[PDB]
Paper text:
The ribosome is an RNA-protein molecular machine that coordinates the vital process of protein synthesis in all living organisms. In this work, we report single particle cryogenic electron microscopy (cryo-EM) structures for a hibernating Bbu 70S ribosome at 2.9 Å resolution and a 70S dissociation product form or assembly intermediate form of a Bbu 50S subunit at 3.4 Å resolution. A Bbu hibernation promoting factor protein (bbHPF) and two ribosomal proteins that are not annotated in the Bbu genome, bS22 and bL38, are found in the Bbu ribosome. A unique N-terminal α-helical extension in the Bbu ribosomal protein uL30 partially resembles the bL37 protein in mycobacterial ribosomes.
A small number of particles could be separated into a class mostly corresponding to the 50S subunit with a miniscule proportion of 70S particles within it that could not be eliminated entirely. This class of 12,449 particles was used to reconstruct a Bbu 50S subunit structure at a resolution of 3.4 Å. A surprising finding in this 50S subunit structure was that the long and usually well-resolved 23S RNA helix H68 was not even partially ordered. This disorder, also present for the usually flexible H69, seems to be greater than the alternate conformations identified for H68 in the Sau 50S subunit and 70S ribosome at physiological temperature that were suggested to be involved in the ribosomal translocation mechanism. One explanation for the H68 disorder is that the 70S sucrose gradient fraction has some not-fully-assembled 50S population. Since no proteins are missing in the Bbu 50S structure and the only unusually disordered 23S RNA region is helix H68, it could be a late 50S assembly intermediate structure. Another explanation is that this 50S population is formed through splitting of a small 70S sub-population. With such larger motions, the H68 helix could therefore play a role in completing the dissociation of the two Bbu ribosomal subunits.
Author numbering:
A (entry chain f): 1 to 50
B (entry chain D): 1 to 277
Write the structure that this text describes.
RNA sequence: CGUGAACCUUUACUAUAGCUUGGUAUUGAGAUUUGAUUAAUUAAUUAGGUUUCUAACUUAUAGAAAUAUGAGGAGAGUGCCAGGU
RNA sequence: UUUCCUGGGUAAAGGUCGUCUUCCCAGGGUUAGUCGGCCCCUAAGGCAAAGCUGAAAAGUGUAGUCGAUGGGAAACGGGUUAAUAUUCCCGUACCUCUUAUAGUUUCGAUGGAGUGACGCAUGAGGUUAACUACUGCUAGGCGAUGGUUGUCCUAGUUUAAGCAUUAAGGCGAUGAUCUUAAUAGGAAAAUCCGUUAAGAGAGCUAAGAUGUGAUGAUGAGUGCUAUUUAGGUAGCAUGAAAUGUAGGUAGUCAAGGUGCCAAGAAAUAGCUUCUAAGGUUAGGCUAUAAGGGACCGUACCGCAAACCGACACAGGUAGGUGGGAUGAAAAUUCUAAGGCGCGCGAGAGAAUCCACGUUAAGGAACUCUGCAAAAUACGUACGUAACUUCGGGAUAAGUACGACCUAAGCAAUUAGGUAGCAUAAAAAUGGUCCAAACGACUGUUUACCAAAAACACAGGUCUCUGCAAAUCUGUAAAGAGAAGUAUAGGGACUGACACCUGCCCGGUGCUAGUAAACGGCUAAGGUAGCCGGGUAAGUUCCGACGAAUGGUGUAACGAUUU
RNA sequence: UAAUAGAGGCGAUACCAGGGGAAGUGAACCAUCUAAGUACCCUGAGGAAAAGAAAUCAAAGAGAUUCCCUUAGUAGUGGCGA
């Protein structure tokens, strides 16, 4: 059964990448929150996939 | 013009008719320097929502740059090169080749033929295809492609088989009977094209099957009584109701006779007698 | 069952989008008689009715803009107040 | 994302064991001018100075700039390593340019124009990889057991890009290259305006074929040393054994040709060409010689224990290769190359569960129900009703034949002989008819209990809207509608087609009227139409409410109901 | 276009100022009200901010602004219900 996570890469980087996060207000809030919490991974761009 | 019918070799062909394209200089590809490829619309707007429903994916078509505004080419005769099929509108398009070398498209009137010479301006003769300001066109003629504001182009009647009737002239204005049937005043300096628009069998066609309706880019229409009350004021069809309510649009606006034109519009001065039901 | 929750409907109640009417600001100058009121038909104001000219204002073309030309018009549009839906 | 290769090891983990593993540890492994990106271009789309619109945050949106699954310069064969190759090597091509030399002349822009540039259906025709039909030709065998040194058997007989030669076919003489006069083009032009007076002009495109590439490489085999399960296998040498005919698939010619309407991307790239400001070896073109290749990906899995399903999971998983025999075919079955023998097994077979095979007599008597099974099935012929919109119904129904050998015959098939219980001998490959209900029919939906009578639908009717339209989303701007224009757009209703669709304006909607409005039938009381048979035995079935939330019929159709 | 000068963002899941501003509740319902300028959003800077030297308080004779103790659960307000 084709299911929930057909894994593209251009979709991954475009929709959830660091530049897509910085591109708007809420994404920058996301980045600040994750920095404050001290996450080891900020965005999907830490998975080097292009 | 003409209608071509089909023998019923399938249950869908029994009532399919199409036009016959004999009055068309066939075998034609559009002029490469006047047509550009384009998307198909499907009725979504800049925000991305659907603003007009029930419009979908038809046949891919190019856009032909028409010219409803022949004003900047007054006094310059041109030649009719060909009569071509246009997918973006009902009527056919004529390709005029001007004496200075520029080529343009116009709406093809009824009864012109290849090789004719067409002229635009106050001095042009009264001949089918010529464009003249309403000043110069005599009372009692039939025109089309009427301009509404000087320099705007033909914004009035344009569809296949239509024409407008000049009734009277007075002051700055000319009374014109439009195809809907109302009598409207037009400023006398706007231009118009003489004669009816050809291709008058366009609407005598019986489409024949749901597939062709899909080709024409028309998605299916879902009635209101087939809905649920969350979806449409008419919903609730537990055994085929009729709405249980005076008929309304999907947004609550009444639909059987309700008049939606604004009650104090700016153009009310220029409408003599509205159309008839 | 709980003075539970949510949804839906209606000629249940109460608000309100939107629509619509009036007044006013935007909003000027003319002509005319419909009047009311105040005194002596006359005179001073004022609501209107029928019309006019464009400079406010807004439609078309050219232009980045400015600006120009061709048409509408103190209307319309937009605020505020009030009356309906 | 190291799972790849080599070596070592078995805490765990592998549904068991384990010397093994995609497990663990160490080491090693991915070489590019020709591949895929990067790059120069644009589709949808995103951002977007200015302008405009909004408490803010922003929303719209022009000039522009980004955005491939698209369009654009260049390479093929063979070999080598424990693992990597159109990347290294051997042999052999091609495209870009930096400088210089020598035949030299109009170069120069984000600007203008052309090319770039396109659909579907569908024959037929020209050659062809692979493959078999036959023969030569090489290599081996010449067969524990009847015959088999010859119409014997087995295997092979291979080889590209590029260059050179030519040219099936298509488009062409209705004009395809060009040579000048005029220039309403917006930068102005010796190009494009392809618009017009001439009158000189048939070529363009193109698979394929041959040679070269190539006495090269490859090569079934044969030859030495080691190994050995006595079977072949590790290095290592050597070897055209036809670049034969016939048939011809899949491309390809072909973005072709012929027809149809639903009339079938853009490019500021590339190619070609044009002129301004500026230049007159400053450049450019035609050649030669020399060297300049960016940056990144490059292993392996990739129909699976390496991707996505919590798993080493009966799932999903793009595209190009698709052998041979049978056959019309990629069906069915068998089989070559190649890849595997499902990661708990072994004894006994009790009942029973589940999935199947066979059957005396009867043949739906079982059961809510011919549910499920059984059976029918192909090819070639004969023969096909009622009804009907004349298209269909229809493969209606029903009937005959099919092996082998010989002969006839282009072949289907015919005739004779012969064999069997069976002779479309395996498998695959429709059960049909009659009557009724509803729906016209293809189709679509309840992902995960409803595939239907529901929706969709062609058609018809009513109503709204004159274009800075109505309408829809927004406080707005703005956009959609629409680069559209009443033969149009939006909404409601009905639902192919045929006959009909009547009465009522009180009430409620809409602008006294309007019912193809909500609705009713005193405002007006509804117009048309809508026991018999079957069975021995039949609560089933068949025959004797209500008119555009539609009434009554109807050919054809249906994984529908009876 | 040129010239310098001051800003962009982060940090404090703290504080302050300005703008926007709910809903769960209580009133044993709810619509007034309450919760509440609460949460949160957005725009600003500072080390504090804001405010700050009376056209004021208020019937006492005081004298800028802000923060405490009292006045005081008082004066009033509230479908005079909470």
């Amino acid at each position: 059964m084709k299911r929930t996570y057909q894994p593209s890469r251009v979709k991954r980087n475009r929709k959830f990448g660091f530049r897509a996060r910085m591109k708007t207000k809420g994404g920058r809030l996301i980045l600040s929150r994750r920095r404050a919490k001290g996450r080891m991974k900020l965005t999907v761009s830490d998975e080097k996939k292009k | 013009m003409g209608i071509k019918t089909y023998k019923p070799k399938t249950s869908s062909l029994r009532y399919k008719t199409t036009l016959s394209f004999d009055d068309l200089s066939k075998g034609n590809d559009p002029l490469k320097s006047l047509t550009k490829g384009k998307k198909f619309k499907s009725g979504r707007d800049s925000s991305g929502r659907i603003s007009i429903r029930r419009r979908g994916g038809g046949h891919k078509r190019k856009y032909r740059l028409i010219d409803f505004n022949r004003r900047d080419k007054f006094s310059i005769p041109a030649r009719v090169a060909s009569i071509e099929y246009d997918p973006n509108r009902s009527a056919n398009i004529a390709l005029l080749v001007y004496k200075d070398g520029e080529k343009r498209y116009i709406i093809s009137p009824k009864g012109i033929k290849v090789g004719d010479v067409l002229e635009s301006g106050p001095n042009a003769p009264i001949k089918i295809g010529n464009a003249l300001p309403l000043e110069n066109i005599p009372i009692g003629r039939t025109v089309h492609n009427i301009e509404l504001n000087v320099g705007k182009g033909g914004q009035l009647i344009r569809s296949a088989g239509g024409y407008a009737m000049i009734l009277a002239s007075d002051g700055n204005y000319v009374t014109v009977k439009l195809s809907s049937g109302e009598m409207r005043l037009i400023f006398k300096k706007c231009i118009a094209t003489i004669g009816e628009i050809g291709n008058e069998d366009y609407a005598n066609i019986s489409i024949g099957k749901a597939g062709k309706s899909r080709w024409l880019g028309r998605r299916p229409k879902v009635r209101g009584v087939a809905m649920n009350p969350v979806d449409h004021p008419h919903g609730g069809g537990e055994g085929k109701t009729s709405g249980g309510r005076h008929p309304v649009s999907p947004w609550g606006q009444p639909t059987k006779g309700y008049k939606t034109r604004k009650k104090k519009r700016y153009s009310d001065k220029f409408i003599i007698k509205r159309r008839n039901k």
